[PDB]
Amino acid sequence: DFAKLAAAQGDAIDSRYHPSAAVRRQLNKVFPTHWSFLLGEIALYSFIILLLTGVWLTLFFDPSMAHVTYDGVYQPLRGVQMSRAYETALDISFEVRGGLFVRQVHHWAALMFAASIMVHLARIFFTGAFRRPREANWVIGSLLLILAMFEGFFGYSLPDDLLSGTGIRAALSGITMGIPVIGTWMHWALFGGDFPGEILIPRLYALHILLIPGIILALIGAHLALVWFQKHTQFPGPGRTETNVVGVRVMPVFAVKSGAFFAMITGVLGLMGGLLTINPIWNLGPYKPSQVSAGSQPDFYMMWTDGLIRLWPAWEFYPFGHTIPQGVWVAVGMGLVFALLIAYPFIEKKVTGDDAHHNLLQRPRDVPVRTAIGSMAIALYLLLTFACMNDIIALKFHISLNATTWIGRIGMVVLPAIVYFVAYRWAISLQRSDREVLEHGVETGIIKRLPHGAYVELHQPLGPVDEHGHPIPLEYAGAPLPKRMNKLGSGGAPGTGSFLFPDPAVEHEALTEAAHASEHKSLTALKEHQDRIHG
Amino acid sequence: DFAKLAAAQGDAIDSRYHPSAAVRRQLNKVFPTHWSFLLGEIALYSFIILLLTGVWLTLFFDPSMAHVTYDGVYQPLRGVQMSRAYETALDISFEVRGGLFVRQVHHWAALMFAASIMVHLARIFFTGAFRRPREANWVIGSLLLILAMFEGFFGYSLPDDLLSGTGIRAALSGITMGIPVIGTWMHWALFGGDFPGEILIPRLYALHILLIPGIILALIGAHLALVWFQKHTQFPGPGRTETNVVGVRVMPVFAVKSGAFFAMITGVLGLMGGLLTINPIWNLGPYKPSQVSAGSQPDFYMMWTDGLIRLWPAWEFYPFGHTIPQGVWVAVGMGLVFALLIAYPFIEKKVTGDDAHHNLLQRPRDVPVRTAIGSMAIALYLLLTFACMNDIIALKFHISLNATTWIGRIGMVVLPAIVYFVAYRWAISLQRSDREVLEHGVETGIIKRLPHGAYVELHQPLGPVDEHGHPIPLEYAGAPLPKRMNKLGSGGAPGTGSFLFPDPAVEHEALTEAAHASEHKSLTALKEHQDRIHG
Ligand SMILES: CC(C)=CCC/C(C)=C/CC/C(C)=C/CC/C(C)=C/CC/C(C)=C/CC/C(C)=C/CC/C(C)=C/CC/C(C)=C/CC/C(C)=C/CC1=C(C)C(=O)c2ccccc2C1=O
Ligand SMILES: CC(C)=CCC/C(C)=C/CC/C(C)=C/CC/C(C)=C/CC/C(C)=C\CC/C(C)=C/CC/C(C)=C/CC/C(C)=C/CC/C(C)=C/CC1=C(C)C(=O)c2ccccc2C1=O
Ligand SMILES: CC(C)=CCC/C(C)=C\CC/C(C)=C/CC/C(C)=C/CC/C(C)=C/CC/C(C)=C/CC/C(C)=C/CC/C(C)=C/CC/C(C)=C\CC1=C(C)C(=O)c2ccccc2C1=O
Ligand SMILES: CCCCCCCC/C=C\CCCCCCCC(=O)OC[C@H](COP(=O)(O)OCCN)OC(=O)CCCCCCCCCCCCCCC
Ligand code: HEM
Ligand code: HEM
């Protein structure tokens, strides 16, 4: 009697505790059903998969520089001195059932985590979800992005590899020693000595499996709690206002679709871990200061920092008996990048004057200057990433390596400007298109007038039509406009039988008019609620 | 202008979010001011100290069996083959400033964590803080205690050491490998092969810094949330009923005293980390299977398991072509111990029959059978703990080792029974003392009656006095009774000047009169609230 068991368990729960009101509030919480609001969930799900795979990895990983000869199964690396970290990474890859798959899905989850964090940041920035109520949310999310970047750095640096080791040597060691007053001291504190200090990988292992994941988990908890209680913002729409949330309740629909989305994201990541090879360390010999490779790139989320290193033009200053190497330039650049990213909402409000409580998102077209600035920043980030990749770009796409370096150097001040101008004008022209639709109706096929030979596109008005043909223009309300009669009530009733065979006409008619009734009922309910809010 | 800044920040917080109601609820939440209710806070604070010191230790610890010759600073161990775990533990002790102190306070915090969990368990069990509500809280607390035990077990085993490695070889290897159907399979899957498998310490490091502490943190969060929202139970008292919480609000008093208690607990832990030596791994040479000491004990929380191993009388079974070693006996004993501890509230409710929602604790004397059972269990635990120490007990206190072993063997069935009987009768006699105090008043000095030589103790009634001398007996109300006029308004007003010199008579009179007025006001407030509730 599962129904009786459920009832008895509910009564016992509500007697021991009293979660009825709280649970009802959680279940009844309404979440907007916009697709772009799942971008953060992608990052959350990738993070969960990262935790689950990282536990498995830590069950088999040994962090240490203790030198050992492999003497494993992988023949191409036998008798070669390597760190125990590399040896156990190879053991995970080869000598544990499914360890290669687990580590590959872990790395793919890391890449998807960074990518989805970037996409979510783009969504919120361009939609203006950081304004008065949620600047703190933006700030903690920026800290979260920085932590994710650096944890991925430490994660692919954990198995001491040739690629990851040379990346560490460059970024960490060089840029740390570069810092003027405390650079060498920071280097010695972090590595416990010179660069190959025998505590580096244990320290990174701790930072990567316990410390940084703990901070990220706490910050994700704060992030999700803030989103939960500062009810999720929404785009302007029929019944959507600054003081309501139009969407679906948590329990019946949102919970089911979020769980299913998590399942599908897990499936995508597992499929990638299977079919796509990620970081094949066995091809990469154990780290040695002398051995190198041509590629020498970090993961894509640090590729922009590496590209900054490459592109910045070797400007070194030599104060009285001292040196200020080119690494400090990039250190300051990264500092500026993070500072501006964290402080943008406050910069935005200082610049514009907006101190209003904003609960309705802005369309990126509707906010041109911010959209232009975001496009400019994305262009700069892409230029830096492809500059880091300039080695492989030059190799495959036959471009001189010097040519790619200087393309990056010039474009990091030219391409941002071009993209800013283009994005600003593009946003304004999207606004112009929206107003054209508002004032003339949707466009359709052309018709030749009866008496004379005029051609008229035979538009379709979206609002009340004047006594004559031309309609009364509507007022823009911040919501997208249907520019195709495709997406309106036109040409949308295929035979509802099946792909290969029809259904009885009675069934088809019943279904089609039932759907018509349901959709017009939804439209009428939204219209009535909209009229009720002010009217 | 700190006041202006605070007001502006409060307005900003209440504009960005709306936490006024929730924050007021948290601040107004009332917590009983009983000392025994700080026992859980001791464990919580020790856990926090453990986390803070563990982060520092992970910054310097390298988990690996990779053999290395020390070549460090500690001369008595130079050129000796040791694992990287032992080498880096020695480095923490010697070649890192304050590292010895940090690891010592970490281990002392672990010991206090276990001890305070045990004391909190005693408090809740004896006061009945688990029945009907909070039974799941007790269950998760039992899981938490088990996790803490094994967490400390992996912790002091983390630096590969002679003592701790011998303890691992005994328990983790022998007990695991003796289990009949899957013993060797569990052993090989935990150790990645034979006992000295090259992954044991890395696996324990993962389990001990991330996995088990993560679960402990999650369960502590659940525990504290349950205590918070299932308002803390309280002892019977003047104004205390099953439907109210008499105490002090969170903000002014409870928060400050809890923070001060945290400060004092961490001060005790730091003082002991300094002044008392814990786990001198430098004295305890590196683990070698051929070497061993005579002590060979685990920390006091696993000492009862070790004592069970020692005392159990070498009963082995040999089925058809198989062996069932004595390790399975102790394994099943531990399983039974944990199962009974976890399932006691449900066992108690099944036995007695009480499923009523209990919010008022019951004094351990008021429940003779349960206090008797708890005393019996504590006696058995102490017997096992001292059996584990029988080696040093025999060495120092001159008692033959066989005599100590057999004293433990006989006592573990005799001592629990003796302690059960004694505790049962002691509880009933405490009840009898309470009743005699209720019906005769408190005792005082003796007086010789005027006409005849009668001697009468000259009691002092606690309630209304009959027309004649003897008082109207009161009814027991589940709350402690004052058995000394000492603790009542009798001889308690010393000159309020100072230790060395007096104060002016006017000031002393003002102070004492104000104090007496405050006592009257408090007692009258309690009395009036009690009357209002029960009338
Ligand atoms: C710092 C910086 C950006 C310096 C400049 C270097 C650079 C990126 C130059 C452009 C590269 C191109 C497009 C070369 C083709 C020749 C060329 C320049 C033609 C004119 C360009 C132009 C305006 C054309 C008009 C039409 C048009 C837009 C054509 C674009 C054609 C292309 C290539 C579109 C896709 C863009 C693309 C993928 C560029 C390469 C970028 C990267 C990082 C590829 C990474 C990558 C590599 C390198 C693999 O080898 C590989 C092997 C197996 C599986 C996966 C991959 C993989 O993902
Ligand atoms: C223990 C209890 C209340 C049980 C309830 C009944 C029940 C549900 C039993 C279920 C399971 C079974 C089979 C239990 C029997 C054996 C048993 C308890 C096994 C599990 C052991 C375990 C994980 C926890 C038991 C914890 C417990 C409550 C211990 C007593 C601790 C308390 C409250 C002591 C009094 C507080 C106080 C002021 C202490 C300081 C004074 C001193 C020094 C007391 C004596 C003392 C103690 C207590 C040491 O632990 C110790 C350890 C190492 C060296 C020396 C000593 C020592 O001298
Ligand atoms: C060589 C070397 C490395 C040396 C250092 C050693 C090392 C590695 C680490 C230790 C170093 C440190 C940082 C030590 C200090 C630790 C620390 C934070 C101490 C704080 C205590 C302190 C300084 C008090 C000052 C006096 C004062 C004005 C106190 C009032 C204001 C304060 C501080 C209030 C704090 C309140 C407090 C304890 C909050 C804890 C937060 C948590 C985790 C839970 C809150 C909480 C509590 C506390 C409950 O009791 C409770 C009971 C029932 C249900 C729920 C709860 C609940 O949720
Ligand atoms: C260190 C020490 C070891 C650790 C100690 C902790 C373990 C729990 C402690 C004790 C359990 C045994 C209690 C005593 C059980 C009483 C037996 C009885 O005869 O039943 C009478 C009851 C009163 O009913 P009544 O209407 O008040 O009538 C008055 C009649 N004269 O009946 C009932 O409801 C209940 C009947 C069935 C009870 C079954 C309880 C045990 C369940 C299995 C769990 C394992 C138990 C392990 C035992 C160590
Ligand atoms: C939270 C975000 C995280 C990110 C972005 C991340 C990223 C990465 C990446 C990219 C790798 C390289 C894997 C490879 O080269 O095969 C890695 C390795 C590793 N990760 Fe993480 N990780 C995260 C969380 C965790 C957690 C929570 C744990 C532990 C529970 C963990 C444990 C490990 C271990 C042990 C390795 C080394 C395994 C190997 O070398 O193959 N990671 N991490
Ligand atoms: C949760 C309860 C915990 C308990 C009961 C506990 C217990 C212990 C004990 C007794 C030791 C032995 C120290 C020594 O012999 O000097 C130890 C070592 C260690 N603990 Fe924990 N610990 C806990 C949590 C943690 C946490 C959260 C971390 C990391 C943040 C951590 C990290 C370490 C490290 C790295 C060592 C090795 C230190 C050494 O070898 O000297 N522990 N632990």
PDB file of C-alpha atoms in Angstrom, chain A residues 189 199 202-203 206-207 210-211, chain B residues 48-62 88-107 158 205 208-209:
ATOM      1  CA  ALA A 189      56.020  30.604  -0.160  1.00  0.00           C
ATOM      2  CA  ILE A 199      55.478  20.298  -2.150  1.00  0.00           C
ATOM      3  CA  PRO A 202      50.528  18.085  -2.845  1.00  0.00           C
ATOM      4  CA  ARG A 203      49.644  21.725  -2.167  1.00  0.00           C
ATOM      5  CA  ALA A 206      44.780  20.009  -1.390  1.00  0.00           C
ATOM      6  CA  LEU A 207      43.730  23.336  -2.919  1.00  0.00           C
ATOM      7  CA  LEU A 210      39.293  20.388  -0.641  1.00  0.00           C
ATOM      8  CA  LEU A 211      39.965  24.119  -0.361  1.00  0.00           C
TER       9      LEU A 211
ATOM     10  CA  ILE B  48      35.707  24.167  13.506  1.00  0.00           C
ATOM     11  CA  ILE B  49      39.202  24.188  15.023  1.00  0.00           C
ATOM     12  CA  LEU B  50      39.838  20.833  13.352  1.00  0.00           C
ATOM     13  CA  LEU B  51      38.893  22.283   9.970  1.00  0.00           C
ATOM     14  CA  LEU B  52      41.032  25.385  10.414  1.00  0.00           C
ATOM     15  CA  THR B  53      44.098  23.398  11.493  1.00  0.00           C
ATOM     16  CA  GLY B  54      43.496  20.717   8.866  1.00  0.00           C
ATOM     17  CA  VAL B  55      43.650  23.252   6.054  1.00  0.00           C
ATOM     18  CA  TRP B  56      47.026  24.405   7.369  1.00  0.00           C
ATOM     19  CA  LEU B  57      48.217  20.800   7.654  1.00  0.00           C
ATOM     20  CA  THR B  58      47.101  19.957   4.103  1.00  0.00           C
ATOM     21  CA  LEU B  59      49.149  22.917   2.894  1.00  0.00           C
ATOM     22  CA  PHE B  60      52.261  20.997   4.048  1.00  0.00           C
ATOM     23  CA  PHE B  61      51.398  17.265   4.067  1.00  0.00           C
ATOM     24  CA  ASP B  62      52.360  14.925   1.210  1.00  0.00           C
ATOM     25  CA  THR B  88      56.388  15.491   5.369  1.00  0.00           C
ATOM     26  CA  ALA B  89      54.860  14.916   8.801  1.00  0.00           C
ATOM     27  CA  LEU B  90      58.382  15.259  10.193  1.00  0.00           C
ATOM     28  CA  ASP B  91      58.813  18.370   8.049  1.00  0.00           C
ATOM     29  CA  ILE B  92      55.649  19.843   9.560  1.00  0.00           C
ATOM     30  CA  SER B  93      56.943  19.001  13.031  1.00  0.00           C
ATOM     31  CA  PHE B  94      60.461  20.397  12.583  1.00  0.00           C
ATOM     32  CA  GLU B  95      61.156  22.380   9.394  1.00  0.00           C
ATOM     33  CA  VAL B  96      57.915  24.414   9.373  1.00  0.00           C
ATOM     34  CA  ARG B  97      57.487  27.216  11.897  1.00  0.00           C
ATOM     35  CA  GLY B  98      54.575  26.449  14.191  1.00  0.00           C
ATOM     36  CA  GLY B  99      53.910  23.214  12.323  1.00  0.00           C
ATOM     37  CA  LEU B 100      54.441  21.095  15.416  1.00  0.00           C
ATOM     38  CA  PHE B 101      52.021  23.329  17.305  1.00  0.00           C
ATOM     39  CA  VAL B 102      49.447  23.217  14.508  1.00  0.00           C
ATOM     40  CA  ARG B 103      49.506  19.431  14.219  1.00  0.00           C
ATOM     41  CA  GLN B 104      49.445  19.040  18.004  1.00  0.00           C
ATOM     42  CA  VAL B 105      46.446  21.339  18.412  1.00  0.00           C
ATOM     43  CA  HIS B 106      44.835  19.500  15.492  1.00  0.00           C
ATOM     44  CA  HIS B 107      45.219  16.145  17.241  1.00  0.00           C
ATOM     45  CA  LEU B 158      47.626   9.548   7.956  1.00  0.00           C
ATOM     46  CA  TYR B 205      44.082  11.266   2.764  1.00  0.00           C
ATOM     47  CA  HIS B 208      40.090  12.231   5.698  1.00  0.00           C
ATOM     48  CA  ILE B 209      40.445  15.718   4.209  1.00  0.00           C
TER      49      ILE B 209
END
